[PDB]
Amino acid sequence: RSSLKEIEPNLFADEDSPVHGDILEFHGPEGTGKTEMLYHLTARCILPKSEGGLEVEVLFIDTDYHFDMLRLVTILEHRLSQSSEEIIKYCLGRFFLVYCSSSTHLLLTLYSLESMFCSHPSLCLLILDSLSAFYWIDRVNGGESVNLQESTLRKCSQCLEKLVNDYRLVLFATTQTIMQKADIDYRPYLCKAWQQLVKHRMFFSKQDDSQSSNQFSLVSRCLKSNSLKKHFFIIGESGVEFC
């Protein structure tokens, strides 16, 4: 019922099999277009089929409290050929947002979301933002024992893998670059189960030069085939546009 190529032919030019459970990951520093990419994916997924959409529902989980409905509405109205309030209402009728305040809160939200997931059959995409939102607090609360710094993340990863395997969903996660290492910059620090659960990896970067910005770099790295690709794209009032 779900096809990965249709979601994004630009980035997913190799994956053509009907997706029946995948885990992806975004990574990079601040202000490099991760949330804009998520907005573009949601816009591609929730638009009507007449305007070039997918007509399936999206679930969103916000952890860093950085979601902006105004930007999403602006992108939707710019992508639409004709702007009308009722069509925007129809589009937004298939969008859901959840807030979590702590690791246990997120764990219980995951333990509760399966009721909706069995209730709603049209869900095809799942987004978790800022998976590394609670790292320092958990680490400090865990003392010097590593196993006490990893339990909540372990349980959340197990629940996420169970959900994605059971309900045939697509997961999009975001992490933050917090620590360096004594061309890809990546110093893994997450849970071992989460690290081994990843399938695709994408890194984000921004041009240092001030050519009015308008240039972002993305490096796609799939662990299945060890294929490294570089993408260039721009972000405008209508969303993101690939160079």
Partner 1 sequence: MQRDLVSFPLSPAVRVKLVSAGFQTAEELLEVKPSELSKEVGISKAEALETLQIIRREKKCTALELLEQEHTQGFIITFCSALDDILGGGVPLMKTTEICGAPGVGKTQLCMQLAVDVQIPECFGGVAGEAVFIDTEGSFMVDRVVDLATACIQHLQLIAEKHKGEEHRKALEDFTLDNILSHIYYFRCRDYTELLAQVYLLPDFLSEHSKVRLVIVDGIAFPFRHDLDDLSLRTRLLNGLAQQMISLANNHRLAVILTNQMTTKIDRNQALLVPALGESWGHAATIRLIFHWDRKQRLATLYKSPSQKECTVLFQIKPQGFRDT
Partner 2 sequence: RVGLCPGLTEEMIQLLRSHRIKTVVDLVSADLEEVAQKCGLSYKALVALRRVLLAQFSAFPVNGADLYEELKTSTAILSTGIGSLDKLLDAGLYTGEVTEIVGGPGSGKTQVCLCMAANVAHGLQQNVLYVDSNGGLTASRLLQLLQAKTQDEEEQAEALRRIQVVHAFDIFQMLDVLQELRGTVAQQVTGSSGTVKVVVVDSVTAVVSPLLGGQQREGLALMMQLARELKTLARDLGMAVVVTNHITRDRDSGRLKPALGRSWSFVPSTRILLDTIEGAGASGGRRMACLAKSSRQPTGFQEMVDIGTWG
Ligand X SMILES: Nc1ncnc2c1ncn2[C@@H]1O[C@H](COP(=O)(O)OP(=O)(O)OP(=O)(O)O)[C@@H](O)[C@H]1O
Chain positions contacting partner 2, by CB under 8 A: 29-31, 35, 59, 64-66, 68-71, 73-74, 89, 92-101, 104-105, 107-109, 111-113, 116, 130, 134, 136-137, 139-141, 155, 176-178, 210, 212-214, 235
End-to-end CA distance of the chain: 30
CA atoms within 13 A on the CB side of 152: 19
Give dist(CA 54, CA 52) in Å, integer.
7
Of 169, 41, 150, 67, the closest CA to residue 103 belongs to 150
Of positions 85, 144, 209, 237, contacts ligand X by CB under 6 A: 237
Residue 98: what are its φ and ψ, rounded to 5°?
A: -130, 145
Binding-site ranges for partner 1 (CB under 8 A):
102, 104, 137, 140-143, 148
Cβ at position 202, least distance to partner 2 in Å: 18
Cβ at position 97, least distance to partner 1 in Å: 22
Give dist(CA 228, CA 61) in Å, integer.
29
Give dist(CA 90, CA 76) in Å, integer.
12
143 touches which of Mg ion, partner 1, partner 2, none (CB within 5 to 8 A by kind)? partner 1
In the complex with ligand X, the residue whose CB is nearer, 85 or 237, is 237
In the complex with ligand X, the residue whose CB is nearer, 35 or 157, is 35
| Structure tokens that stand for 239 in this block | 């969303």
In the complex with partner 2, the residue whose CB is nearer, 107 or 202, is 107
Cβ at position 127, least distance to ligand X in Å: 12
Torsion, Cα 9 15 16 17, to 10 degrees, reads -150
Of positions 30, 144, 183, 208, contacts ligand X by CB under 6 A: 30
Residue 236 within binding range of ligand X, rule CB under 6 A = yes
Cβ at position 168, least distance to ligand X in Å: 27
141 touches which of partner 1, ligand X, Mg ion, none (CB within 5 to 8 A by kind)? partner 1
Residue 32 within binding range of ligand X, rule CB under 6 A = yes
CB within 8 A of 67, min separation 6: which ones? 60, 97, 129
